[PDB]
Structures are given as C-alpha cells and as structure tokens.
Design a protein around this ligand. Structure first.
Ligand SMILES: C[C@H](CCC(=O)NCCC[N+](C)(C)C[C@H](O)CS(=O)(=O)O)[C@H]1CC[C@H]2[C@@H]3[C@H](O)C[C@@H]4C[C@H](O)CC[C@]4(C)[C@H]3C[C@H](O)[C@]12C
Ligand SMILES: [Mg+2]
Ligand SMILES: [Mg+2]
Ligand SMILES: [Mg+2]
Lengths: 93, 1114, 315, 176, 52
DNA sequence: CTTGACAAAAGTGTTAAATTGTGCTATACTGGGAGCCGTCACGGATGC
DNA sequence: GCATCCGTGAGTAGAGGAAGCACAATTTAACACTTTTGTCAAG
C-alpha cells in the first residue's frame, strides 16, 4: 500500500482525478529537474546506495509526498496553460 | 536387497508381444520373404491383382510378380544424412498384342517402399516416426430406428471408406419404399426392376408381412423392360446428360457392381453374411454378367427390414458404438490403401499412352511411369495426420505411442463435430480399450490405448482372452473372442476363490452382457484371466490402483511418459510386476542370444563367444540425442570371463536399472506443512539431493548453418571475420568451427560465416566518419552463428556435409552445411516439476540446507516435504499406502511386488512394520540409550488425540505409533519435536520434462511482422507476449486509459512512436505522445480495395489526412 | 484454527463436589481430567479454570513456554480489566490483531473470542477492519495473519495416515439392514404386487437413504471421539474438503450412473480406504469420462456468452 | 576439485579398454577421502598410471608426503587388456558445498571441474535423558553422537565447533 | 444484471407515424423518439405513438 | 589563393553476341471427370 | 405453417513444421575513346 493512500483518496471527488494530478505534477518535477519542489530539505525522499544516501530519482514518489503537505493547488480553469509554463520556466530556467 | 511378492491369482498365459500390433501388420502387407507363388491375396499383392490387367478396349498389360531389394543405406547413415530407410520395388510385367499374339516381358523399377525398424517405427527424412492405428465404423448392413416417427426403421449399407456411396432403405409415410443415393431419393422399385425382378417374384417371399409388400407392387414400371428401366434410372441419377445405353450401363455397373470402384471389404462381407444369414460370392452389391444385372444383397436386406418392422422375434436393431461394430485399421492396411490409390493413377497414364504414339512398337518399360505411385506413398509417410513425430523421452514413451488408437485422421471424425456419445466408455470396452488412459481437453475419448492382453484379429476386431469353465472347475484352455461373441456367456471374475481348480464360493460375481449378476458355480461358463487385462501398460504400472480416484489415476499414467532419464536412476521400492517386461520389449537394452562367455568388455562394445564357437560383437549406443533432446546411452553390466545364459542382460539401456524400468529416485518423504513453502502443491526438498547427484539429467541441443551461392557472391565459412577481437575468436579452429570440448555461453560464436554486402552507398554521416579515421569499408559482413540467450554447455560433436558427398542430397544453391551438438548437465533447481505415480505433482519452490530439515531421533534427515492438504479432495490414497510400505523396506532392506487389485493389504503391511520396529528401536537399546525426554512429551499429547492406549509403557506406545506409519520428528531449526507424530516413509518420485530453464523468456525490442508491423510471437523467434481481447477488457475495467494506449500504439505498431520512445529513454526523458497505429492504416486501405470510401473527419466534418499526404495525387 | 480450538476430556465428566479444594484434590489423585466439565457448587467449571489463574497475557504465555499448560487448555486470564475464561491460544489470537492494527480497544471489538477461527469468521474480520481502518491498516493485518498461520501449522503436527480414515461401526449394521429390505422388495415383486418400474424406483430410494445415514455416522464419530482428526479438522475449518468427499474415503462410494443415464441397481459398497474391486472400478469410470467431456465441450458456451455481454454493454 | 585424463577432452566421452565412462569415474572420485598431515598444506595433486587388465583402486595413487588416503579399497575403474589410464587428481582444502560452476578450477586446458563437498562430518545426533541429583529430579543428561569420514576425528570436530560458537558470542560486545 | 437488461429494453416500434417522416413498424431507439416527440409538441404537431 | 600540369575515374558511341518474342505445322480426329454420410446442431430471417 | 438458406461455436503457451524449328526484335556486354576530377609541385 502506498503511504497515506487513504488520505489521498479523500482529497478528490473522483479517484481518477487523483491520478491525473499526480501524473502532471511528476512531469513538472522531471522537466525542471526537481528545482520547483515545495518540499523542505529534511522532507526530500531518499534512496540508499552503496556510495551513500541520495535523492530519490522516482518523480511519482515525489509527487505523492508533495500532495500530502497541503501546499499544492489543483482544479479546473485555474490559469491559461501557455501562461503557466512561461512563468514556471522563467522562475526555473 | 531381497524382493517379496504378494498376490494369489495365478496367471495361465504371459503378456503378448507389446509391439505386435505394429510389427505383425506391416509384415503381412509386404510379404517380403514369402516366395511369389505362395503369396496370398493380401497386402500390396492384392492391390497388384486388382488394378491389373490393363486393357485398352487390342493391347493388354499384365502383372506376374514383384520383389523387394536390399536397402541402399543403413539406418544410422539415413539418420545422419537425412535420408529415408527404404527398399527398391521391382515389378515383372508382360505386354500382349491381341491382334498378333506377340509377348514381351521385362522387369520395371517402381520406386521405394519405406522399411520398418525392429522396434516398430520408420525413419522418414532422417526423423523417427510412428503410424497410429485408426478406429472407425465397420462396413456392413445395419438397422436403426427412425428418430422422428416411432415404429419405423432405416436400413443402411456401408462400404469401405472412399469405396462407394452409402445406401438407405426407408419406408415412406405414403407406403412407398425409397432408396436414397448421393443426396437423391428415388423409389426402390426402379432399381429393383433393373435386377430382373417381376411381380410374381417379389410377393412370394416378402408377402408374409402385410401392408409393406403392397408398397412394392406398382404396375407402372412392372411391365417396363429392364433396359427401359435402366435408362430411366440414369436420368434421375444425373439429369441433363444425354440418355444413351452405352453411357447408362456404364454408370449403373460402375456404381454398385464394379469391383474396382465398390468394395464392401472382407470385414464388411463377413458382417453381412453373419447378419442376413446369406453367403456372398464377391464384395459388391450386385453382380453383372451375360449383359444383365443380378442381385446379391438388395433382396436379403429388404426382407430383414420388413420383418423387423412387422415384429418377428429374431430381428433386432444394431448398436453403432458396440465394439463388435467398430474395427481397427493398422499401419499395414493404411499403407496399402494409399498404395492402391497411387497404382490406379499409374494405370490411368498407361491407358493414355498406349492409344497415342508408336502403338505398333511398344515395350512395357516405355508405358509405365512410376512417378504417380511414389508421390502417393511419399505423401502418406510425410503429411498424414496418422504419421506423427515419435515420442522418445524415455523407453516407456515410445512403447505407449505405438499402442495408441485415434478416431481422427482421413476418413475419421473431426475434433469439433464429435459429440458426447462417441466419447463415452462403452460396456464392450472391458478388456479391449483402457477406460482411464486418455487426454483431457478437446481430445478426451477420441484418443485411447489398447488393453494389455488385447490383440487385433485379421478382420480388425479386438479380442480378449477368457478361461473355459466346465462343470464348476476351471481349465487352462484360453479362448480369444470378440465383443459380439462374448455377449452369449456368463463370465466370472478373476478373484473368484478356488480350491485348486474347483470354484469354492457359493455365490459368484459375474457379467451377463456387461452387467453384474450373482450366480451359482454351475452357471459359470468363462472366467477372466487376470485383473491386468482391463487396463493399459501405463495404468498397469501404478501400485495400489484400487485406492485411487480415476480422475487422478489418469494424470499418473500420462505423466510417466514425460519422465526424463537420470544418471543415477533406480527402480521403485514398491512395484507391480510389469517393470521387467517393459524394458525387454522396448529393445532399449541388450541381451545374450544363447549361452556363452564374455570375452571383451568396453564402454563402446561387448564381444561374446557363444558355445558354438562363433564371436559376436555388440556396439553400444553412447550419448545419443533423441527427438526430445534427452541423452540415450547404454552402459555395460558384465565383466570379462563371465558366463551368461540365454536371455541374460548384457547392457542397461536408458531409464533402466539391472533390467527394471527406472524413471526416478527413491526418497525419504515427510507429510507435513512447512512454513508456507508447501502452499498449493509446492514442494520443499533438501540440498543433500544435489550433493549426491540425484535428479541429475543430460540434455543435448543441435545447431545448424548453411553456406549458399548468391548473386553478390558465395558465403564462406571462415575464421577471418571482420571487426572481431581475439577474445571472440579464441575457441574457433582454422576452419571457423568451434573446437570440441569448448565451453560456450550466450553470445559465443559457434560457426563463423561472412556474406557479401548488398550494394548500397552509405549515409553522409558515416562517410565523414570513415574519412576521419582513414578506414576503407570492407565488402563482406558478419553472419556467423551464435549461442541464443539462456543456452549453452559443452561442444561434443560436429558434422560437416559437402556437395558431392555420397548419399548427401543438398538443395540447389547450397554449398555445405555444418552442425554442432552441445550438451549440458542439469541439476534440480527451483521451478522444476516433480510427480509420483498417483497423480501428485508440483514444482520445487525451496531448497534447504541439511541442518534445516526435519530429522529422525537417530539424526537422519528427510529428503522431501509434502503438504497433507493435497490428499483429501483428490482422493488418491494409494500414495499413503506406498509410503507405509516404503517405511518397512527402509529398515528391513527389501523391495516389494504388489499386483493391482491382488496384492498387499493392511494386515500384511502392519506385520512388516512390526518387524521393522524391532530393528529401528531394538538397535537403540543395545547401544545404551533409553527414551528421550522429548519423546515423552509427544507421547503425552498422542493419547489425548486418541492415537495410543493409556497405561502402556513408552516403548509399547511408540510401537503403536509405528504400526500406523508415524514417528516422532525433530525440528532442525530449534531441536524441539513436532507436537504430533508425523507420517514418514519412502516414495518413488520422477523428474518431468517441463523445466523452468526452457521456459523463461523476456524481450524489450526485436523482429516485427511484415504486413501489420507488430511484434512476432514465440520464444524461438524472440517474440513478444500476446495482449489479447480479454486482457484489454481488464484494463478498461480499471480505468487505466494511458496504460492501455501505450500497449496499443507505443509498444506494438506505432512505428514513429516506438522509435521516439526508445530514443527518449536512452536520453533520460519521458516518452512522447503516440500516434495512429499502422494496422488501422492497413484496414482503411483494405476497405478501399473493396470499393468502399472510408474517410476520417474532424469536428466540422472536414477531411483529415492520416497518410501525411504520401498517398494524395498532388 | 488449530490454536483457537479448545480441548475436551471425559474422565471426570459429571462428578460433583462441594468446595473448589475438593475438586482440585481429586485432580492430583487422577480421578478427573484438567478439562473435564464438573460442578463445584451450582455452576459448571473445570479444574483448569480453578487451578491456573493468570494476571495478564504475558504470564499465561510464559507458562506455555515452560510447558505448564497448552494453548488449547481452558484457563482463567485477566485481560482489559475483565476476568476471562479462555485458552492461551485465543488470548494469543487477540494479541495478533491488536498489534497489527496498533489499537488494543478497537481490535477487541473486531473479533469473536469464544469460537474457533474458521474461513467465514476470518472473512468477517477482514471486512470490518476495512470499514473502520482503511486499506493501509487492513493490508498490514493480512500479512500478520498470513505469518502466524504458517508458523503454527508447521509445529502443530498435521499429517495424513491410512488410519486417519476412520471407519464407523454403524456401516456394517446399515449394510445388513439394507440387505433385508432389498430381499423383501424382491419377495413382493414375485407376488405381483409391484411392477418393474416401481421396483426399480424403490431400490434407488433405499440406497439413497442408506448413503445419507452413513454420511452422518462418519461425521458423528469424528465430533465425538476424534475432534482433532486431520480429515475432520480440514473440512470443519474450510481449509480443504466437503462431507461428500469424506464419505467416499471413510464410508461407501454409492450409486453410479450408466452411459445412457440410468443408474446401476448394485451400488459400490466399498470406500477408497478398503479398496474397490475390478468390476466396481470399471462401473465408476462411466461417470468420470462423462464429467470430463462436459468440461471440455461447454467452456466454449460460457466464453461465448461473455463476449456477447461485453459487446452490448461496453458503452 | 579437478581431474585431468590423458586423451580425454570432456566428461561426456568414453575411453577404449575401460568399462566405465568419464561421468561414472568422476562419481567414484567424489568418494575419495584424503587427509592432510600438515596444517599449512592447501592443495595437492595425485598421479595415477595403470595398464590393464586390472581393477584400479584408490591405493594405486602414487605416495605423496604428508598425504594419506583413508579408503584405499575404493574402486575407481575396471581395465581390460589393451586399456590405459593416466590421470591427475587435484585435492583442495575448503568448507561447505561448492558447485563446479562456481569455482571452475582447471589446472590445464582439458581438465574437468568437479563439484566439491568439503564437509568431513557425516551424521550428528544428540540424546537427552532424565537424570537427578538428590532432591532435584528434572535435570538433563546430554549425549552427542558424531560420525565422520576419518580425516577428522569426532573429538577434533567437536572442539572446532565449540570455538566457532564461542567466537560468535564476542560479536555482542561493542554496541555501535 | 440490471445494467444488461436495460440494454435489452433500449428499442421501440412505431405504431402511428403522426406528423413525422417515420414509418409504421419502424424500429428505433427509445431515447431518440422521446426527443423527437417533445420537439413536435413545441411546434404544435401530432406526436408519434410507439410500443415498447 | 592561383597557374601549369598529370593520371585516373567516369562518361560516351559502336558493335557483336546472348537473349527473348512470335508464327507455323494439311490423313482424320467434334459434350469433363471426380466423387462417394457418425453428412454438425441450433437460431434467426425470408419466402411461400 | 412450413421449407430453404446462412452464420455461430473460451484464453494463453509450445513445437514441429508434356514439340519443335526458323527467324525477327530486343537486351546486354565488350571496347574503345573523350571528358571530367582529383593530386602533386610550385609559387
Ligand atoms: C508490537 C511490536 C513493537 C512493540 C514496540 O514497542 N515497538 C512489533 C515490532 C516488530 C513486530 C514484528 C515484525 O514486524 C515481524 C513480524 C511482522 C508480521 O506482520 C507480524 C509478526 C511479526 C513478528 C511482528 C510482530 C509485532 O508486530 C512486532 C514484534
Ligand atoms: Mg494435453
Ligand atoms: Mg492456582
Ligand atoms: Mg568429502
């Protein structure tokens, strides 16, 4: 079971909207190289390696954890899509 | 290790030769060694005399005799060079000129006839093959009731298959008796008039029934002459053709009276005479002579029909599934049938050649073209449903293959259109067809086995032996009888108690026409020979069969065919008594011909000097690869200077131990759950099995490659392959072939080959790259043979065939072919399948170190742990009794023979367990040890479970548990006992052909299909997995829209999408959006070829181009 | 199931006493058993409930490790502020659920403590936990149940021997009664009282009734004398088997059908433990083949229905 | 661990004049018991040269210093007149069970690796009896029964096992 | 089961065309004819009479 | 980066030899040949 | 009310598997020769 899956299912009206929000957020993290995250340094997911602890490379794992903090906003007709990417690219070149 | 035998029934005859159904039938057809003048009119001799003489209608070609020559190549040479083991056929013909009277004789070469090996198989194009016997409805005359309307019957006349049409005789509601031929129904009187039957003749014999004869008394055609009736009948049969007497008599005579076209058969003629009570001169419906037709069978058939409808006591309907109405076609008859087909084609080319071209100057050799005859025989032995790839996983596998009976094939039933009734166990199957051995699935009841004591008679009916009983005493006279003959007697069971030869029981269990009855000893007429005559060879190898459910006994007998030979194979502790004869009749071992002395013993050959003085040398087959990939070799069992008797064993064959069938190992088994690794048929084993090489088998694989002539140039097998390092070419010799003894792994080169590159100028980027490094492109490319993924081993043999070599027939354009044999030694591993003879099977899921296994108080650990939850719902209790008897033999050091339905019983097993306890526990007391503290704890619970008697001493209570097959067992991980006594014993377990090594496969990308551009299928092709319709439904029910779209486009046939996805992943990116699949583009084009305009539109109904503008005419 | 089922003894089984000291004193003399039901003053108790009184689950399970009592012995244990009368193995089952969900009070409401845990009771526990706790906590309870179930079945000593197929004593008496009634049906048939059809139907009715009585005699013998028999435990818990398959092992096989559909007049009166005769084995093979042909020839009919349903409702 | 036979390329072959094949001969070599008399010795090679007719036993190996064969009567092969056997057998020292695929040891080109079963212990059992001392009555009496192959005595094996258990008990000393 | 049966009762048969181009005995979907009828009532035309 | 070279690789008629396409044969000859029932059983739609 | 015609029957895996001849048209290959295109040496 994914951690906090019960709370994630309670945040949306339809279970398929949760999958849409998670998948689009993970694409945002991959495209900007995880520099747009809302997580604090002590909250970043980690994986254990022979050389030491490093950042978790799985973007889907990051998206689920961010959505549990309450710092993301999701909905329909929030912003124009072209204007969303332009500002996010300017903030995170 | 001594052998103890149970049972009371004394068999008066031994088993017949187990391959005589194949061997004896093919000898009768050929008649190869019978002198020509003493040959009987059977087999291919009967076919020669049927087609000949050939008359032009003044030239006659006649047949005198034939002979068979020596084979050109031996059996082992044919296997190596991919030839057919055959013999030339010569015919001695003479041509007679009727006008003049001059005769010429010469011998003409007719072709080659395949030869059967001593064990009963053929070598066709270098591969072993088996001809399977066919069962079908017997020809004759049959009477069945009318299903639509009661009180009415239908009479049928059935010839041999493809030897005439079926004839139906029915009484219509109007009262007219009608005859139906070739889907056409016409009154019977029209044909019955052609046979010269008048009004006075018909009413004399059939007028003793009533209103039925009135329907045969029409005066419209009674006065009509037989010649006029003949022409009128011809118009009804084939309307449209001009009515001529010359054409009319040709059709009628050729439909029911021509022996070359209509054949009732020897079995059919015998059936017709027995039923109708008549005597037939030939095998046709009517006899034509003196320019007229004469009746042979039509009148007696009609009398039976009328009398059956009237209700005379002596006439009854026929059961079509009765085994007296079904017959077997063996290999000799099936081969001879195709020989007659091809011979009729040869006579057709003789006729067209003797009326056109040099009629006055002819020779028999110039008339005869044997090409049609050879094509008929070649087609039968290659592409017939009954000619099958031989099963030789072990010697028992090939023996069973030769005794199978199939209802399918040419002239047989179809798998899809076969109903329930034809698949059932008929009551006449008793003693003739095994009731339990059959495949489950779409072939159930359509493929069966011959009973162990059965034999097929000359007409094709199965007979089973019975003992004559006279006046209450049983004699040793044995009579073989068919099902129809068996129905007339009261037959007692084989277990009937006897005092010598006198029947001792007052009440006897017997059968009367298949049903059980209780009778007095004076009413008995016959007796069964043994219980073994009811079952087949495979089922007869299962001990305690009477304690097993038939659904699980079917699995046990089938899976003995799939057992692989082991390097340390041994015979089971508990046997039935057929293990010796199976090895002997399979011809896999070597026996002495007569008394003599062994002179030379080697791993390759044995030389025996016989008492007449002559020396005989026997070469040994060593490390040979079978059709299934298992190694077959023979190991000598004698020493130099040893005296041998006639029939003594000289060398063991595969899966045999001192002449006994050995399909597995004898292991120590505990029946208990273990930590969930036994869950749902899974099996736990010990690492000690691997340490002593139990369940270790040898397998051999073959690889091949060719060097051809091409337009660009010839392919060359060479060691000098471009762009290859020395590490890759290390194990190749100077000729480019891997050396013998090398160890190969996936990706290693086996044979090196180069091919001339096709003419194609390179891409601009490559041209600049070659300019930078100053390298000149070569004219050849690497096309060498490499080890496929997941394979490998040791190279043990190479074979090189070249064009021009004697006996080598290579295809045009092929220069040479190289073959490499690779062998590996397989130990048991997780994922391998194991089974016993009672139908218990499962895969190995866990291998434990020896200190983890449960062990006996003396320190002995068990080998295998089986879950007790698989027993109760399968109801196969035979494995429990085998375990109890194997526990007694472990301590007493003896083996047992318990025949089926007459063998070991619990009081005898418990008397043996009492002796085994005296050595299992009396040994401990002498050594100075008492009862363990841990055994006292288990005994305290055992009497709360009601297993032991309260008040007894611990030694007496331990013996009470031993007589039930239970011991106190310790846990290896903790050292504490299991809380209850556990059943422990010895069991015989086989390792099956299905191994996880041959079945694991994976793929990322690979070959694609031509038209649909989708991935190929199959592990051998490196193909992908089929994601079918029901799998698509599951993804839809989940709501996984994006996962479903990837499988439809990005991973099957979106050519642009699958290229972009691969490039994105190797760059560390997410895969892009998919596009239109290619198979949809194919569907649009194929619909346009059907003149249908299919167009894709957008929201505004405007056209959308999905072909990128590549198919639009500007 | 094996740890949550209690023991029953018969040695005392009815003796009456006056004070608990009298009942305990008789136990050491060997007159009564630990789990035999007795009566102290007016109530029904056992020696184990009077002798072993534990202050908490840890003390009761420590006594099990020392071999003082078994997990199937009924004792007195104090748990959650109540004086319970159960076995240590039922207390152990309660702790498995409490630690898996990490809530002692909620887990106490989820379980039935006074019954052995069978397939249906365990299914009810899963559904209630899903309602109260969600998927994440329910998936943790499933793994704990899986872990302890495998551990306890290994060390308990479950095995199958030939003597575990116990033959009841009433089978011989029933088969003798049926012989007399069958011989009477034949007597009246010769007198013309009944025809061929009604004689046929009466023989079938006699054997249908006899088979049912043997089925109840098999299971009555188990629940009274061998309550821990491997076959009885497997069927009662729902692990494997049904009473129809048990009767064939321990009682009789019964009537068989002909290929035409009719039934043979003589049944198969032997079980798989005793062993069938050759004729009985052949008679039974008609129905085994018929069952196999039904499976092969009718799976296509079911799968064709599924494709019809999908294509009418997929939108 | 590894065997080399002259004029033999792999283990799936036969030798002229020899009754047994290479697979059977190797199965016989897995039953040989060799005792090293020097604790510092790690590997030795045993040489055999024979001509038929004779039954070659384990005593036909040439003598080597500080090496002893414990079962000299072990049968190896049967030689017919005209047969020859010239082989070198390598014996290593180790622990546990090591398949031939894991070590793959070959001293020369045509050598054949052999699965190694290094353990000298054949069977172990222990008994617990009921003893007493004065008033105390529930005391234990322990007996250990050890079966070995002869290269290591049961008393030597018992001492080595006690040291292994004692060594492991020191791992609970320093909590990190 | 109720989802499947709802698809089994999805069609109707015309008994009286009324003021429409439909034909007597024509089979069409129940959803379509109900939409067609309520449109005719708005324009004051005779409705279609159908049968389940 | 620009000249003079310099042979070479590629391009261009010319022609003899393989290779391919086509017409013709005069005693008289005038309607095919293979099939051949455990023929599969049941429901729906059409035409009488 | 009935005779005639037509489309339907679960999934995955394997592993074997009989005419010449004459002569005109057309295509191809061989062989020179002319022209174009790099290298080399200056410079
Ligand atoms: C209650 C106890 C912790 C108490 C504390 O104070 N901290 C926890 C901590 C670790 C837990 C065990 C392990 O998970 C392995 C295993 C997992 C299975 O699922 C259930 C059984 C096992 C044995 C568990 C039981 C129990 O749940 C334990 C002992
Ligand atoms: Mg199959
Ligand atoms: Mg107390
Ligand atoms: Mg050793």
């Amino acid at each position: 079971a994914e951690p906090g899956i019960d709370k994630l299912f309670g945040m949306v009206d339809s279970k398929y909207r949760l999958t849409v929000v998670v998948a689009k957020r993970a694409q945002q993290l991959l495209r900007h190289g995880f520099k747009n995250t809302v997580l604090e340094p002590e909250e970043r997911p980690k994986m254990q390696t022979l050389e030491g602890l490093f950042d978790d490379p799985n973007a889907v794992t990051w998206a689920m954890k961010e959505l549990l903090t309450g710092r993301l906003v999701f909905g329909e007709n929030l912003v124009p899509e072209d204007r969303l990417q332009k500002e996010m690219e300017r903030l995170y070149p | 290790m001594e052998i103890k035998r149970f049972g009371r029934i004394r068999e008066v005859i031994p088993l017949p030769p187990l391959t005589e159904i194949q061997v004896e039938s093919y000898r009768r057809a050929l008649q190869a060694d019978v002198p020509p003048e003493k040959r009987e009119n059977v087999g291919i001799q009967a076919a020669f005399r049927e087609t000949f003489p050939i008359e032009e209608e003044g030239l006659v070609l006649d047949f005198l005799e034939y002979r068979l020559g020596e084979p050109p190549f031996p059996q082992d040479e044919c296997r190596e060079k991919d030839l057919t083991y055959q013999a030339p056929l010569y015919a001695r013909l003479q041509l007679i000129h009727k006008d003049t009277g001059l005769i010429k004789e010469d011998e003409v070469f007719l072709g080659h006839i395949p030869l059967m090996t001593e064990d009963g198989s053929f070598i066709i194009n270098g591969a072993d093959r088996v001809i399977v016997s066919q069962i079908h409805r017997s020809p004759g005359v049959y009477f069945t009731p009318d299903p639509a309307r009661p009180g009415r019957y239908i009479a049928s006349i059935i010839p041999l298959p493809k030897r005439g049409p079926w004839i139906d005789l029915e009484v219509e509601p109007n009262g007219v008796v009608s005859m139906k031929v070739n889907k056409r129904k016409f009154p019977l009187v029209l044909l019955l008039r052609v046979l010269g039957y008048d009004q006075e003749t018909l009413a004399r014999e059939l007028g003793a029934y009533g209103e039925l004869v009135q329907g045969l008394m029409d005066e419209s055609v009674f006065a009509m002459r037989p010649e006029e009736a003949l022409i009128r009948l011809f118009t009804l049969l084939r309307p449209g053709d001009p009515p001529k007497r010359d054409k009319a008599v040709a059709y009628v005579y050729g439909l029911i009276a021509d022996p070359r076209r209509y054949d009732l058969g020897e079995a059919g003629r015998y059936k017709a005479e027995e039923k109708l009570g008549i005597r037939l001169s030939g095998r046709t419906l009517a006899r034509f002579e003196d320019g007229e037709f004469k009746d042979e069978v039509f009148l007696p058939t009609l009398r039976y029909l009328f009398a059956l409808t009237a209700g005379v006591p002596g006439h009854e309907v026929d059961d079509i599934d009765h085994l007296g109405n079904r017959r077997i076609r063996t290999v000799g008859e099936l081969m001879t049938d195709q020989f007659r087909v091809g011979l009729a084609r040869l006579a057709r080319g003789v006729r067209e050649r003797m009326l056109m071209g040099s009629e006055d100057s002819l020779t028999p050799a110039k008339l005869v073209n044997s090409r049609p005859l050879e094509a008929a025989i070649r087609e039968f032995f290659s592409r017939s449903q009954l000619s099958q790839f031989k099963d030789e996983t072990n010697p028992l596998s090939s023996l069973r293959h030769k005794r199978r009976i199939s209802a399918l094939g040419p002239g047989g039933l179809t798998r899809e259109r076969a109903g329930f009734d034809v698949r059932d166990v008929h009551r006449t199957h008793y003693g003739r067809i095994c009731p339990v051995e059959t495949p489950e699935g779409a072939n159930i009841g359509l493929i069966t086995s011959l009973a162990a004591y059965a034999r097929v008679d000359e007409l094709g009916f199965i007979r089973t032996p019975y003992r004559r009983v006279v006046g209450g005493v049983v004699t040793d006279e044995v009579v073989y009888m068919t099902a129809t003959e068996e129905d007339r007697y009261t037959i007692a069971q084989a277990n009937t108690p006897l005092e010598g030869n006198r029947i001792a029981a007052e009440r006897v269990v017997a059968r009367r026409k298949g049903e059980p009855v209780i009778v007095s000893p004076e009413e008995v007429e016959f007796m069964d020979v043994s219980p073994k005559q009811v079952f087949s060879v495979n089922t007869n190898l299962i001990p305690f069969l009477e304690h097993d459910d038939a659904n699980r006994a079917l699995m046990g007998s089938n899976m003995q065919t799939q057992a692989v030979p082991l390097i340390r194979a041994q015979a089971p502790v508990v046997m039935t008594g057929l293990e010796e004869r199976v090895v002997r009749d399979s011809l896999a071992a070597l026996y002495a011909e007569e008394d003599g002395e062994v002179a030379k013993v080697d791993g390759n050959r044995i030389v025996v000097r016989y008492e007449d003085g002559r020396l005989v040398e026997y070469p040994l087959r060593r490390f040979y690869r079978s059709n299934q990939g298992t190694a077959l070799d023979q190991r000598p069992r004698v020493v130099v200077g040893q005296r041998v008797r006639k029939g003594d064993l000289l060398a063991d064959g595969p899966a045999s131990e001192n002449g006994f069938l050995a399909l597995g190992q004898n292991v120590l088994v505990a029946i208990m759950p273990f930590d969930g690794y036994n869950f749902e048929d899974a099996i736990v084993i010990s690492e000690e099995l691997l340490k002593r090489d139990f369940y270790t088998s040898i397998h051999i694989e073959r690889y091949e490659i060719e060097a051809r002539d091409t337009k660009l140039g010839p392919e060359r097998i060479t060691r000098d392959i471009p762009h290859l390092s020395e590490a890759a070419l290390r194990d190749l010799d100077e000729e480019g072939v891997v050396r013998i003894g090398a160890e190969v792994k996936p990706g290693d080169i086996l044979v090196g080959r180069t091919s001339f590159k096709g003419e194609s100028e390179p891409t601009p980027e490559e041209r600049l790259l070659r300019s930078i490094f100053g390298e000149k492109a070569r004219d050849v490319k690497d096309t060498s043979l490499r080890v496929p993924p997941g394979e490998g081993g040791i190279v043990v043999r190479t074979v090189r065939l070249r064009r021009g070599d004697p006996g080598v027939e290579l295809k045009p354009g092929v220069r040479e072919v190289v073959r490499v044999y690779v062998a590996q030694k397989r130990k048991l591993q997780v994922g391998d399948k194991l089974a016993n003879r009672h139908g218990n099977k499962g895969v190995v899921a866990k291998i434990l170190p020896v200190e983890d296994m449960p062990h006996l108080p003396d320190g002995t650990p068990v080998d295998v742990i089986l879950n007790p939850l698989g027993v109760p719902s399968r109801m196969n209790l035979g494995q429990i009794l085998e375990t109890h008897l194997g526990l007694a033999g472990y301590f007493l050091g003896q083996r047992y023979i318990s025949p089926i339905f007459d063998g070991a019983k619990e009081p005898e097993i418990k008397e043996l367990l009492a002796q085994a306890f005296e050595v299992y526990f009396g040994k401990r007391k002498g050594e100075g040890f008492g009862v363990d503290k841990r055994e006292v704890e288990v005994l305290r619970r055992a009497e709360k479970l009601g297993l032991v008697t309260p008040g007894k001493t611990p030694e007496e209570q331990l013996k009470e548990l031993f007589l039930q097959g239970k011991v106190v067992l310790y846990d290896g991980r903790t050292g504490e006992p299991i809380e209850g006594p556990i059943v422990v014993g010895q069991m015989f377990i086989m390792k099956l052909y299905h191994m996880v090594e041959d079945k694991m496969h994976a793929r990322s990308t690979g070959p694609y299909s031509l038209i649909t551009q989708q991935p190929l299928g199959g592990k051998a092709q490196f193909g992908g997995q089929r994601f079918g319709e029901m799998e698509v439904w599951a993804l839809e029910a989940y709501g996984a829209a994006h996962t479903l779209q990837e499988m439809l486009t990005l991973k099957s046939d979106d050519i642009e999408g699958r290229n972009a996805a691969y490039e994105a992943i190797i760059k560390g990116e997410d895969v892009p959006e998919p596009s239109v699949p290619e198979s949809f583009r194919v569907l649009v084009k194929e619909l346009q070829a059907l003149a249908l305009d299919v167009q894709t539109l957008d929201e505004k109904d405007n056209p959308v181009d999905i072909f990128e503008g590549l198919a639009s005419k500007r | 199931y094996y740890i949550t089922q209690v023991r029953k003894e018969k040695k005392g089984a009815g003796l009456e006493f006056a004070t608990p000291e009298e009942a305990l004193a008789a136990h050491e003399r060997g007159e009564v058993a630990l789990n035999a039901p007795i009566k102290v003053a007016g109530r029904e108790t056992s020696v184990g409930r009077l002798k072993y009184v534990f202050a908490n689950p840890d003390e009761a399970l420590l006594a099990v490790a020392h071999g003082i009592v078994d997990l199937q012995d009924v004792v007195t244990v104090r748990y959650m502020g109540k004086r319970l009368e159960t076995s240590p193995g039922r207390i152990l089952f309660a702790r498995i659920v409490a630690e898996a969900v990490e809530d002692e009070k909620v887990a106490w409401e989820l379980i039935q403590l006074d019954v052995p845990q069978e397939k249906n009771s365990l299914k009810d526990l899963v559904y209630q936990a899903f309602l109260r706790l969600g998927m994440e906590k329910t998936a943790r309870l499933l793994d704990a149940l899986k872990y302890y179930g495998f551990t306890f079945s290994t060390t308990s000593g479950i095995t199958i021997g030939i003597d575990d197929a116990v033959i009841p004593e009433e089978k011989k008496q029933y088969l003798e009664e049926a012989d007399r009634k069958l011989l009477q049906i034949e007597q009246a048939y010769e007198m013309g009282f009944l025809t061929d059809r009604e004689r046929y139907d009466q023989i079938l009715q006699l054997w249908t009734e006899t088979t049912e009585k043997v089925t109840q005699a098999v299971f009555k013998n188990f629940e009274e004398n061998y309550p821990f028999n491997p076959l009885y435990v497997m069927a009662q818990s729902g692990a494997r088997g049904n009473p129809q398959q048990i009767r064939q092992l321990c009682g009789l096989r019964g009537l068989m059908q002909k290929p035409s559909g009719e039934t043979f007049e003589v049944p198969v009166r032997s079980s798989f433990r005793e062993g069938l005769t050759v004729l009985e084995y052949f008679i039974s093979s008609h129905g085994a083949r018929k069952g196999g042909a039904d499976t092969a020839l009718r799976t296509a009919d079911s799968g064709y229905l599924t494709r019809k349903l999908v294509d009418v409702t997929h939108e | 661990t590894s065997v080399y036979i002259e004029d033999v390329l792999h283990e799936f072959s036969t030798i002229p004049g020899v009754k047994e094949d290479v697979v059977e001969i190797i199965l016989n070599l897995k039953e040989l018991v060799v005792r090293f008399l020097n604790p510092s010795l790690q590997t030795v090679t045993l040489l055999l040269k024979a001509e038929g007719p004779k039954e070659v036993k384990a005593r036909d190996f040439l003598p080597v210093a500080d090496v002893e064969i414990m079962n000299p009567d072990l049968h190896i092969a049967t030689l017919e007149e005209g047969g020859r056997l010239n082989m070198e057998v390598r014996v290593d020292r180790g622990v546990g069970y090591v398949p031939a695929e894991k070590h793959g040891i070959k001293d020369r080109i045509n050598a054949i690796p052999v699965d190694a079963v290094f353990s000298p212990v054949r069977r172990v059992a222990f008994q617990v009896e009921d003893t007493r001392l004065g008033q105390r009555t529930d005391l234990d009496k322990l007996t250990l029964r050890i079966w070995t192959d002869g290269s290591v005595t049961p008393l030597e094996a018992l001492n080595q096992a006690v040291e292994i258990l004692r060594e492991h008990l020191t791992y609970f000393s320093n909590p990190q | 089961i109720e989802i499947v049966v709802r698809q089994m009762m999805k069609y109707v048969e015309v008994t009286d065309p009324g003021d429409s181009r439909l034909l007597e005995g024509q089979v069409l979907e129940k959803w379509d004819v109900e939409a067609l009828n309520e449109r005719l009532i708005a324009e004051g035309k005779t409705p279609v009479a159908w049968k389940p």
